[PDB]
């Protein structure tokens, strides 16, 4: 659980990249993500089946 | 029911077009693919629901 704060969360190289085979946001659209302000962001990473 | 649509309908307007909404960078003109999906979506209506 890594905390992300006081930075810009541009997804120009994240969403546009085809390297991610599964990308789904349950609260907002990726298109409106870039123009939506946020707060402290927690990043959780793991490897599963 | 249509999950997503490029624009916002003016009041009392019906949309039947089933063209594959392309949100991804590549247009996916033929079929789904990179952030390209079928606009319509069915209900999970159930007695258990």
Q: How far B19 CA sits from the closest chain A CA (Å)?
A: 19
Q: Which whole-number Å values give the CA distances from B27 to A32, B4, B45, in the listed order?
A: 19, 16, 32
**A16 with B23: Cβ contact below 8 A:** no
Resolution expressed in Å: 2.7
3-state secondary structure of A13: coil
In angstroms, the CA B31 to CA B44 distance is 24
For residue B45 the two structure tokens come to 């209506």
CB A44 within 8 A of CB A1: yes
Any chain B CB within 8 A of the CB of A15?
A: yes
Method: cryo-EM
With an 8 Å Cβ cutoff, are A31 and B23 in contact?
A: yes
How many C-beta neighbours within 10 Å does residue B35 have? Answer: 21
* Separation CA A29–CA B44 (nearest Å): 22
What is the DSSP track for A1-49?
Answer: -EEE-SS----TTTTS-TT-S----SSS-HHHHTT-----EEE------
């Amino acid at each position: 659980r890594k905390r992300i704060s006081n930075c810009v969360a541009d997804y120009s190289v994240l969403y546009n990249s085809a390297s991610f085979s599964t990308f789904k946001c349950y609260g907002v659209s990726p298109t409106k993500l870039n123009d939506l302000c946020f707060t402290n962001v927690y990043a959780d990473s793991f490897v599963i089946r | 029911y249509r999950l997503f649509r490029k624009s916002n309908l003016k009041p009392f307007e019906r949309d039947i077009s089933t063209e594959i909404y392309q949100a991804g960078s590549t247009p996916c003109n033929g079929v789904e693919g990179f952030n390209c999906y079928f606009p319509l979506q069915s209900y999970g209506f159930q007695p258990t629901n």
